[PDB]
Structures are given as C-alpha cells and as structure tokens.
C-alpha cells in the first residue's frame, strides 16, 4: 500500500515530499491515458480530467507540456527536455566470422 511503485517519477516525488511538506498518496488513473480532447463532446480523458475535476492533485508523470493542455491545466517548469529522434539499427558490421582471410 503506497509502496507498489518505483521509478524515476517516484524518486522525483520523494525529494519533492522532502523539501516541500506533504505525504504522497499515489493513485493510478482509471483510463490509463495521458490526456487528449475528445472531439465529439470536448470532454478530456485520462490524467488531465482528474486534474480539472480536482479528484487528483498532482500529475508527476510523462505529461508533455503542450498548447491544448496549458489552457485547461497549468504545468510547472520542465524537469526534463526531450525531442523526436530517430531509432535505427547499428551498422551490421560485415559479419566476418573468424576465417575472413
């Protein structure tokens, strides 16, 4: 109970619970979704819905700071800056074996 969880975001929140005074109550989202505006109704789903409806209080997670999320919830400063990069296989050698001479 509140000891199931471990990772980078858990190590961040413990230091956030140290210098800033609280005792955390980690609670998984029901949807399992980051957050996006559903088109047919405008109703947000995922973590960003619980932040608007005040069911949750913090969202320490891989939650990308973007334009459509900024007008509904408010983020802190970026603790990690990333981008889009190319994942690709390392050059395959020549497969010489050992009798390549």
């Amino acid at each position: 109970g509140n000891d199931r969880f471990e990772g980078y975001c858990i190590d961040l929140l413990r230091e956030l619970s140290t210098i800033l005074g609280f005792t955390y109550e980690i609670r998984l989202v029901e949807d399992g979704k980051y957050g996006a505006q559903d088109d047919v109704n405008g109703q947000w789903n995922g973590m960003v819905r619980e932040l608007i409806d005040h069911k949750a209080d913090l969202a320490v997670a891989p939650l990308a700071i973007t334009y459509v999320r900024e007008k509904v919830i408010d983020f802190s400063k970026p603790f990690m800056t990333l981008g889009i990069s190319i994942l690709y296989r390392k050059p395959n050698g020549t497969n010489p074996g050992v009798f390549s001479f």
Binding site: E15, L51, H54, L58, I73, S76, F79, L82, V98, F101
Partner: protein
C-alpha cells in the same frame, strides 16, 4: 533532436502549489539531483561501444582464424613427432 518539448508536474487550473514546485525543481537541477536520477534509471548496463567503434584496424575478429590454423599445424606436427620417432625405433629391432 527534431522537436523540443518537455515533461511537467501537472497542477489544477490556478493552483498555488504550482509555484512552489517551480521553485523546487530548479533547486534540484543546480545541485544535480535529477542528473543523478537520470543516470540511475536510463543507465544500468555499460555497453560495448569501445570494443569495436568500426575497428579501423585488423583484429582477432577479422584475422584471428590464422592463429587457429597455426595452432592446428603445431598439434599435428607433434603427433607426427611421436609417430616418426616410433618408426625409427621399430627399425632398430
């Protein structure tokens, strides 16, 4: 990098504790708490990149079969060296 975005600790709309985490994150970036955590989780296994790095010189992975056929010649010669010494001693009888 192609784009440049960032993760963030989410708060509700107009929350007072957005500002205290804003002060808190920048404190841990200067004293290096996050970089000790980013090296703790995203690392965990030192790879082999220094073993080859394209290997722009011929090594055991490229030429080392000539040492095996060299060693196979010496083992075969000793088996002849035993077998030829016995052929002479049989002639003495």
């Amino acid at each position: 990098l192609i784009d440049s975005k960032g993760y963030g600790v989410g708060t509700p709309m107009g929350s007072p504790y957005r500002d205290k985490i804003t002060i808190a994150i920048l404190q841990l970036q200067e004293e290096g708490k996050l970089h000790m955590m980013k090296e703790k989780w995203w690392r965990g296994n030192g790879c082999p990149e220094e073993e080859s790095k394209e290997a722009s010189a011929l090594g055991v992975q490229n030429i080392g079969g000539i040492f095996i056929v060299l060693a196979a010649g010496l083992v075969l010669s000793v088996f002849v060296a035993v077998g030829e010494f016995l052929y002479k001693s049989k002639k003495n009888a």
